[PDB]
Design a protein around this ligand. Structure first.
Ligand SMILES: Nc1ncnc2c1ncn2[C@@H]1O[C@H](COP(=O)(O)O)[C@@H](O)[C@H]1O
Length: 493
């Protein structure tokens, strides 16, 4: 085969081939600074030498604390070239979380800027990375770790082969080429960034760095994606709401985009209809992606169609080629098609397990012989094999003599045309009087009363599942990993 993705078994061999083949092509740009693949390859080899001198060796975990930018990408490549795995430290971590990640991962060096009180001593600072930039021109194997990203905190080691499997699966859904330009946006601590970086590099495309000046507003974001000829962007549904409003109000031309890829959050039609109204569904194509750190970024995709806009649920679509699936009931047996159950996943994109958590790993990665990962997500299979996303599987509570599926109440609230987000919690009204309540986010340009939401829910659910009060918020508060902060919601009440 001529295909570098199919032919290489690790990310370093892949990158080296893609660079050596056409080294003058642009790999990375930051404003007008264009860094060719050849330049990036030499630069990251020089930084790898610097890491070797700090005693980094194959199998090590090297911490990385940098904002997404050219130096950070050089640092990742250098770490991988040393046969080591990178452990990204979210810049916004509380100090204690960063301390735990560094301890738990056994990180033996850090590249970038240490957090205040950082216990890792062997540091290659960002400035030392930049110093290697224009100097001249043992490697990992498939089963070597490429990164350890922390979730919830549990460390998830993902191997070179896991990432290659994802990359080999992408073309079943996307038409990418080396003429695309991908925006690097997400924190290196989020696996969305693994996809932004390797989607670009695996295809010989250009990774465009969002400048620091453009970090704050959707107007600034749009200005850059249009100025720099970006063709692929990856966004949370939440970010997409802000992007749409800015594009529409600002009269911007979005039609240079080829793909907008959503991930991380439930996507429903009220989040999509305003963009589709202004811009249609072809240029760019919009594609909902569902996935998990434990199964290498993306598992299923659903390209958005008119049919998506006409229904009120969330459809995550079909699994990539590497995957086997089950939808599993409480009794541990498969549900009947159409029934809601827990998604279980198998295949080459599954991580090996968690780092130093044998107990959790055995529970979350059972064998059935086929090895599975229990997603903790409830889904249902549609007649055609596409999956609908329901909610997290840990949201049943006991209240007032009932078991109550909070995920079902959230889904029902999300069916309302003017709602873009919702969370249901329990709060105390008077002393011994606890009741369901719902905080929600209105679609921009709408306002819905609690009475109207009550009337909506009356048609869908029995009374014991009705929220007693509704609270509109200008967005729900999010945790570190970007999940809804149910404790912060409680405080907002
Ligand atoms: N398209 C999506 N729709 C709904 N939930 C999603 C989607 N993508 C990711 N998630 C949620 O995010 C979790 C993965 O979190 P993370 O491992 O931080 O990527 C999944 O288990 C889902 O609960």
């Amino acid at each position: 085969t001529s295909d570098p993705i199919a032919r290489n078994s690790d990310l370093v061999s892949l990158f080296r081939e893609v660079a050596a083949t056409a080294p003058e092509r642009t790999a990375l740009s930051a404003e007008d600074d264009r860094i060719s693949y050849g330049r990036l390859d030499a630069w990251s080899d020089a930084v790898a030498r610097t890491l070797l001198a700090e005693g980094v060796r194959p199998g090590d975990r090297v911490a990385l604390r940098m904002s997404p930018g050219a130096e950070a990408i050089v640092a990742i490549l250098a770490i991988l070239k040393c046969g080591a795995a990178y452990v990204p430290v979210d810049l916004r971590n509380p100090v204690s979380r960063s301390d735990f990640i560094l301890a738990d991962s056994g990180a033996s060096a850090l590249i970038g800027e240490p957090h205040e009180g950082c216990a890792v001593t062997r540091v290659v600072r960002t400035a030392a990375v930049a110093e290697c930039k224009d100097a001249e021109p043992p490697g990992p194997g498939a089963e070597d770790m490429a990164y350890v990203i922390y979730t919830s905190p549990k460390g998830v080691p993902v191997r070179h082969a896991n990432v290659l499997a994802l990359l080999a699966g992408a073309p079943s859904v996307f038409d990418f080429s080396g003429d695309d330009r991908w925006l690097l946006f997400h924190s290196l601590s989020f696996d969305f960034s693994v996809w932004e970086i390797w989607g670009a590099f695996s295809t010989g495309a250009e990774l465009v760095v969002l400048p620091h000046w453009a970090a704050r507003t959707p107007e600034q974001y749009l200005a850059v994606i249009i100025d720099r000829g970006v063709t692929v962007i990856n966004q949370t549904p939440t970010a997409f709401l802000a992007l749409t409003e800015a594009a529409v109000r600002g009269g911007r031309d979005v039609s240079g985009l080829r793909y907008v890829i959503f991930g991380g959050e439930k996507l429903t039609a009220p989040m999509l209809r305003p963009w589709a109204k202004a811009f249609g569904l072809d240029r760019p194509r919009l594609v909902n992606g569902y996935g998990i750190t434990e199964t290498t970024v993306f598992t299923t995709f659903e390209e958005i169609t008119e049919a998506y806009l006409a229904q009120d649920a969330s459809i995550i679509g079909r699994a990539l080629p590497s995957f086997g699936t089950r939808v599993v009931g409480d009794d541990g047996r498969d549900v009947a098609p159409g029934e809601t159950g827990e998604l279980w996943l198998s295949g080459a994109q599954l991580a090996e397990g968690y780092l130093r958590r044998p107990e959790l790993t055995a529970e979350k990665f059972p064998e059935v012989s086929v090895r599975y990962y229990r997603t903790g997500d409830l889904v249902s299979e549609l007649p055609d094999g596409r999956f609908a996303y329901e909610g997290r599987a840990d949201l049943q509570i006991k209240l007032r003599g009932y078991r109550i599926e909070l995920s079902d109440i959230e889904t029902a609230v999300r069916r309302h045309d003017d709602v873009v987000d919702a969370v249901v919690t329990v709060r105390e009204f008077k002393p011994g009087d606890l009741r369901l309540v719902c905080a929600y986010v209105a679609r921009e340009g709408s306002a819905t009363t609690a009475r109207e939401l009550r009337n909506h829910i009356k048609t869908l659910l029995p009374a014991y599942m009705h929220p007693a009060r509704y609270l509109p918020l200008p967005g729900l508060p999010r945790t570190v990993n970007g999940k809804v902060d149910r404790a912060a919601v409680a405080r907002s009440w």
